[PDB]
C-alpha cells in the first residue's frame, strides 16, 4: 500500500533503474541498479 508501478509516460526517466510511484506523497521516483546513485540513478557509485 506504499509503492506502485509507474506510468508508460515514465520510460527514460530512470537512467539506470525502474520507476516507482509513491502513493503517500503522490510522487514518482526510481529504484537503481546495484552500483548507481542519484534521484534518477545517473551516477556510477564507487562500489
Amino acid at each position: 500500500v506504499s509503492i506502485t508501478k509507474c506510468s508508460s509516460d515514465m520510460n527514460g526517466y530512470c537512467l539506470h533503474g525502474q520507476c516507482i510511484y509513491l502513493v503517500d506523497m503522490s510522487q514518482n521516483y526510481c529504484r537503481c541498479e546495484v552500483g548507481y546513485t542519484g534521484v534518477r540513478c545517473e551516477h556510477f557509485f564507487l562500489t
Partner: protein
C-alpha cells in the same frame, strides 16, 4: 578532529534491493558525526540494526526519514539541523510514511538531543506505528520565521505507546523513559536572554552564538556553533587578518587572525583552493577576476579589461540542475580554457532527454572542449562517441585541481566507454582526489602511467579495474611504443607517449 561524512541526495530513490540500499546507507554514515549534506534514512526493513546512526550529531542540510519498516531509528545524539537546504523547498526535517503494508513499522525515534533548527520547518505524515512524537512542542526547536510552514498531521493507529514519563515537562518526550524528555532551550528562556539558554534564570542565558544551547555563558561553552567555529570558540565571523586602529586611523596586524574556510576559522587555506584579499578560502573568483600564484599563494586578482571568460561547470550557475554536457548547453562552452567547477558527460547527453526538453548531442560538437586546459573541480565521463578511440576532446587538458570531488572523493572518473586509449597526453597534474578507471571494455594503456607522478597530495589513490586485461592488450600487441619506455603512454603512437 570531528568525524565527517558527505550525506546523500537520493531523495526517496532506492539503490538496489533493500539489502543493497541498507549496505550503501551504512557504508555512508558509519562513525559519522557531522553530515555536510543531507541525512536520508529511507527503506530500512524490519530487524535491521541502525546502530551507526547513534554517532551523528549535526546535519548541515536536511534530514529525511521515509518508508522505513524498521522499528527503531536511534538518532539519539542529533543536536542540530542547520537547514542549508530544504526537502521540498520548506523542510529541514521530513518524516514520512514509515510503515509496512501489514500495519506495523517505525515506532521509536528518540531524538532527545534535537534542540535547534536554524532554517526551515518540519513535516510529519503517515507514521502509524510512530510512538510519542505527537508530544514534542516544536515552537522551541524551530525558528519563529518558519512556524507557519510546518504541516505535521500527528496521528497514529497503533496507540500502544507508553506515555511520557511524568517527569517530562508538559508531557513532551521523544520516547519512553525519563531520559527521552524534551529539553527546552528557547521557550523557557528568560526575557533578558539574547537567545538560547539552559534555564529560565538570567544566569543560564547562553551566548548568542550558541546554537543548541550551552554549558556556561562564555563563547567557548556552547553546545553547537551558530555561525563560525574558531578552535573551541563560537564566533559570529572569523577574526580578520588585520584590524582597524580607531586611534591611528590605519590597519594593524591581528595576531589572532584566521582564514574563513567553510564554517571554520583555519590557520591556512587548503593547498588547491584560492585566497581572497579578505583572508577567505574560496572555490572560485567572481567574474572579471582571475586566479594566479604569486608567493606560494593561489589568489584572486581583478582584471582591468582583458581576462578569461567565466565558464561555470555542470552543476553551478546557468547549469543549475543539469545532469550533463548536452545539446542545450554545449554552445556555452565555446571558448573556455578554465572550467570553474565540474564537468559531467552522461549517456543521456547522447540519447537525448525528453523530460528536460534536451535533444541528442552531436559527437562532433564535443571538440569544443579542446580549448580547455584547466578544470578546477572534477571530470566525470560516463559516455563518449562509440566511434571514437580516445578522449580526443581533452588532448590539451593539463590540470584537474579537484576542489570539488564526486561523492567527495573522485576528481577524475572515466567509466564504461568504448575507447581503447585514454589519449590525455597533455595531462600533467591532478591536484587532489582519486582516479577511477572502470568498465572500459577496450581500454589498454592506463596501466603504463605512473599516476602518482600527477598527484599533488599523499593518499591520492587510483582504481584501475575491469578494463581490457593487461595480458589481453599485450597479447594483441596493444602496448606502448618502443621509443617510450620510462613512464608509459596514453596510446600506441609516439606522441601519446609521456616521455618519448
Amino acid at each position: 578532529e570531528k568525524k565527517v561524512c558527505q550525506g546523500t541526495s537520493n531523495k526517496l530513490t532506492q539503490l538496489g534491493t533493500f539489502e543493497d540500499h541498507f549496505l550503501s546507507l551504512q557504508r555512508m554514515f558509519n562513525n559519522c558525526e557531522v553530515v555536510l549534506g543531507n541525512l536520508e534514512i529511507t527503506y530500512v526493513q524490519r530487524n535491521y540494526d541502525l546502530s551507526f546512526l547513534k554517532t551523528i550529531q549535526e546535519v548541515a542540510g536536511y534530514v529525511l526519514i521515509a518508508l522505513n519498516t524498521v522499528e527503531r531509528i536511534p538518532l539519539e545524539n542529533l543536536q542540530i539541523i542547520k537547514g542549508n537546504m530544504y526537502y521540498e523547498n520548506s523542510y529541514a526535517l521530513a518524516v514520512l510514511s514509515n510503515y509496512d503494508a501489514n500495519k506495523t513499522g517505525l515506532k521509536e525515534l528518540p531524538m532527545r538531543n534535537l534542540q535547534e533548527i536554524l532554517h526551515g520547518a518540519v513535516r510529519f505524515s503517515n507514521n502509524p506505528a510512530l510512538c510519542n512524537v505527537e508530544s514534542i512542542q516544536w515552537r522551541d526547536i524551530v525558528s519563529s520565521d518558519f512556524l507557519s510552514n510546518m504541516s505535521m498531521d500527528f496521528q497514529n493507529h497503533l496507540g500502544s505507546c507508553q506515555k511520557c514519563d511524568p517527569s517530562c515537562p508538559n508531557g513532551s518526550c521523544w520516547g519512553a523513559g525519563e531520559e527521552n524528555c524534551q529539553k527546552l532551550t528557547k521557550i523557557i528562556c528568560a526575557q533578558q536572554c539574547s537567545g538560547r539558554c539552559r534555564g529560565k534564570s538570567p544566569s543560564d542565558c547562553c551566548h548568542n552564538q550558541c546554537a543548541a544551547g550551552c554549558t556556561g555563558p562564555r563563547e567557548s561553552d556552547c553546545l553547537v556553533c551558530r555561525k563560525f567555529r574558531d578552535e573551541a570558540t563560537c564566533k559570529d565571523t572569523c577574526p580578520p587578518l588585520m584590524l582597524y586602529n580607531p586611534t591611528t586611523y590605519q590597519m594593524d596586524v591581528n595576531p589572532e587572525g584566521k582564514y574563513s574556510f567553510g564554517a571554520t576559522c583555519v590557520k591556512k587555506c587548503p593547498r588547491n583552493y584560492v585566497v581572497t584579499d579578505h583572508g577567505s578560502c574560496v572555490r572560485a573568483c567572481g567574474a572579471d577576476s582571475y586566479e594566479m600564484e604569486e608567493d606560494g599563494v593561489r589568489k584572486c586578482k581583478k582584471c582591468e579589461g582583458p581576462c578569461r571568460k567565466v565558464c561555470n561547470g555542470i552543476g553551478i550557475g546557468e547549469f543549475k540542475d543539469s545532469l550533463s554536457i548536452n545539446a542545450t548547453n554545449i554552445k556555452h562552452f565555446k571558448n573556455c580554457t578554465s572550467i570553474s567547477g565540474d564537468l559531467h558527460i552522461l549517456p543521456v547527453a547522447f540519447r537525448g532527454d525528453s523530460f528536460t526538453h534536451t535533444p541528442p548531442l552531436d559527437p562532433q560538437e564535443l571538440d569544443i572542449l579542446k580549448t580547455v586546459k584547466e578544470i578546477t573541480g572534477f571530470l566525470l565521463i560516463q559516455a563518449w562517441p562509440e566511434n571514437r578511440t580516445d578522449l580526443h576532446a581533452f588532448e590539451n587538458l593539463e590540470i584537474i585541481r579537484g576542489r570539488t570531488k564526486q561523492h567527495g572523493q573522485f576528481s577524475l572518473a572515466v567509466v564504461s566507454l568504448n575507447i581503447t586509449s585514454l589519449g590525455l597526453r597533455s595531462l600533467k597534474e591532478i591536484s587532489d582526489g582519486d582516479v577511477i578507471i572502470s568498465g572500459n571494455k577496450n581500454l589498454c594503456y592506463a596501466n603504463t602511467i605512473n599516476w602518482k607522478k600527477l598527484f599533488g597530495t599523499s593518499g591520492q589513490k587510483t582504481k584501475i579495474i575491469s578494463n581490457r586485461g593487461e595480458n589481453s592488450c599485450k597479447a594483441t600487441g596493444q602496448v606502448c611504443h618502443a621509443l617510450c619506455s620510462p613512464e608509459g603512454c596514453w596510446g600506441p603512437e609516439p606522441r601519446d607517449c609521456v616521455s618519448h
